[model samples]
Target: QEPIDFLKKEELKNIDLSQMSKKERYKIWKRIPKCELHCHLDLCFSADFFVSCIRKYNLQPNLSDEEVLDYYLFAKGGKSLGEFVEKAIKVADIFHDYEVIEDLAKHAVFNKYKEGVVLMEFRYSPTFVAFKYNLDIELIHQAIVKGIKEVVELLDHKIHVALMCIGDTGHEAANIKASADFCLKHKADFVGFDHGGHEVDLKEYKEIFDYVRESGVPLSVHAGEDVTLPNLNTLYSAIQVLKVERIGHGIRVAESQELIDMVKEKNILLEVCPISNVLLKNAKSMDTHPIRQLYDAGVKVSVNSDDPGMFLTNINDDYEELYTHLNFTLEDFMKMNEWALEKSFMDSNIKDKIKNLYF
Candidate 1:
């Protein structure tokens, strides 16, 4: 008689993942078309992108490739939320111009191919670019729209970039409404909000959420990142009460199975950025990441690089870490890859094309 181990056997390890040749593993991983549902456009710039910006701007030292990477990789392993965002914002501001956006789109698309990302919905605030360019909201949106369209059409590899609005700073309904209206007017691929600072009074933007919903654009919010359980209570109310379509970084909810069920019933996808969470010390490591629990519980979920350069991560790196550290099985990887594509705001035709890559 043999005793059966209830715990599912971990997948057999044959590859030296840490030092394995990139070409070797990439061949296997690249078969699946990767999709990033919640990455910020401003945050996805590569080291070369920044270096070029420094050279163009003619800033001090005009940073070398190694120096630029070192700058982007600053304190990347792990840190507090406050610490991470501070450095991230500083790095992001190093570049400004239509050229910057165009270059970033190209860089991200290149990274996309290396990572097998067939489609990516890159999000950013029009307000950020508006600061330096002095361009109207409409003009900024047009430039970005133009830049992304050119890349996708020319690359021939299928990179779909979408826009996302940030509403966390505008606490009042009116400001948030204007931002939502602007995003809608530009016909962005998605309409979502995030709280970048310590201010957790996102509740004030409830009306903006309603406005986005009425416009028929999907919604996701940054909730449960820096706050305590009481803070998560407020977020829960927003979903269970106000009814957001998705939630990003819902890490704390892992503490309660009941709340997890609530998320499942709502059919909301929790966009978890594993590298960002771990490096920010949101939790000890990816092993304890709630995404695994959320998946097992049948809660819809996806992966993202909230700030790729800042977090020293990217869409592929995030997926690879999930695969290695969490030991996500082949079946698991396939499901998540498909889920992200299905959840994307891309047209049905593109979505169909992206879905086929999985097979």
Candidate 2:
């Protein structure tokens, strides 16, 4: 049997990255008209921005603003997705008020625009904050909508926000259902589901995927991440049955030709986060990571900051890493971003705008 090559070193992989001059690589990474299909809203904040989110909401917390900032600072620029999401909520607690929530959403969009992201989707689990405010989920939904409305007039960049239900795809079917229902009711641009805590069992959660499918919501599953065998199975089930449109951290698919072929045949996109995969020890080094390999294999892949503030990465750095380490050419890198636009859920009218600009 042929061994599955999840992360392969290319023939040219031995090239030294640090030896390259700054201008040589920076020229390759700038302003290619990106389509970032995945990211978490709260995790995109900077330390200074978070303090404002706290003050604007008149939020009271056990930790001081500075302490909270320190706590949320991802050490050496690395954090697991669950830890990142949890810390993001703690930071979001500073936005205790809905108006503040609106402000943060606006700020997040403005930041992404400045980063040259032409199209993006910001996902977050609103269940925690909605419960914190002791309000119905509608309040949570309105805060973000208000934020998006504010950003649109301020920046030419387009942003679509979605609800990422934190319920385990392996369990928590009812919770997942409630979150999806809330998203649909609020007219959330999309509703995606992810299970980021421990390894979860998904057999009983078919009902939740059914709810997502029934609502006609765009579905995404976090599968093929760093976990045991069952975690991969959860992902397979998600794609095969739920018809998930995308896979989050779907790095494991790189290990199986059959699986990768199936994914490509279905046109399911892999929302690959390069650095996060490294920090979480999913990949030994950036060079051996499957992002470049799977991408070159004709997989529909998009670069994302699964958690930017937490991972200390943005779309730009994610692109730069490839140029620095992978020795990618300017033309090829831009072509990869085209895949991002190709997989975006943005309305065709807005999408057409991207096509004219990039393609």
Candidate 3:
């Protein structure tokens, strides 16, 4: 039997997904109402977005038009997670100016709507940009919030966009405080907080984690993203110790049945980004991705685009991969989105609005 047949065997008898053209497959996937739980705002911009910014700022074009796209996206697969992030931080360097950051935020919010995303949570660490460029953190926050609000005014749909402050471990000890401050001060716009970068020791972040905990901001951490690393310890602690409500990429839980059972028992959501996983060399390929194993084992999973431009992918592409490559039915897609909305950081009123209208 083909790989697809092993999954949803009886349903495969009725649907011949292999016969569907790429266009046909995309049409179906894009129509599915999607909830985006894990997208880095700085890396989600289009080449058009970049060129428009350059045109507005009149920066000398080291590269123009298609080259802008080529530079930001993985024209080919990335060599490793470390290499991908080096380029990701380089992209952050160009975004020092608030005008560019605001415009990029506006573009990503609207673009995700076009891709059928009714709700999205965008995360980034302003501390990195603040420290690198010597800019005030508040200016950066206002710029992004302003951009999101401007575009939001044009839409009649009950669409929602929330921000996440990424507490960067690679930066100053005060960086985590800056992130927590953003979330607390702008609780309406910034709904959640996250900590990421080198999962070497989650314990090092305990003090800041406790601060966010006491402040009552929701948590969804980037843990166990790379399948190559011996990072199960971090993922385990993210649950037992850090107590993150949701996990960034808990794919490595497949390495230990005990971990799988723990996540399921705790009802922790895993934001699984398929294309990013393979391109980062986390998983060898989609067909062999641990998302399938996690799903079959009854673990809650949400397909996300960790960095759409960085990986040259989006939420729809991840969903399509699950369907065409892994034989996941529309039923599966609905469940993932439902879980995303349920575990999402948005307040009850907004969540209820989206569920009643879209779900």
Residues forming the 10-long window of minimal summed lDDT in candidate 1 = 1-10
Per-residue error at 293 for model 1, in Å?
2.2
Pairs that collide in candidate 1 are 78-279
lDDT of each: 0.64, 0.65, 0.77
Please write out the lDDT profile of model 2 over residues 1-359, one tens digit for every residue. 11111111231244343566766444324345566777877567666776666655555467687776667556354445455445544554554667767777787787777666667777766665554555455676678777877787655444443345544322222266566666565544554555444444454577776776677666776777664454467667768876788887889888888888999999998988887777777777789888878978888877887777666567777778766677665456556667767666656677777677546
Please write out the lDDT profile of model 1 over residues 42-82, one tens digit for every residue.
66766656667767766547667677666655435645766
- Show where candidate 3 strays beyond 4 Å: 1-19, 54-64, 68-72, 170-174
Error of 2 at 27 (Å): 6.5
Per-residue CA lDDT of candidate 3, range 1-359, in tens?
21111122233345455678988777666666788899988678766666666566555467767776666566467777667756665555566588877888888888887787888989977776676467777898889889988887876544588889887665433367667777778776677888765545576677777778678887888888866675577887788888889998878888889998999999899998888888878898889999998999999999898877666676778988888778788778878888999999888898998887656
How close is every model to the real structure, measured as TM-score?
0.83, 0.81, 0.89
Candidate 1, which segments miss by more than 4 Å at Cα? 1-23, 62-78, 132-135, 170-175, 188-201, 227-230, 356-359
Clashes in candidate 2: how many?
A: 2
Error of 1 at 211 (Å): 1.2
Among these predictions, the greatest TM-score belongs to 3
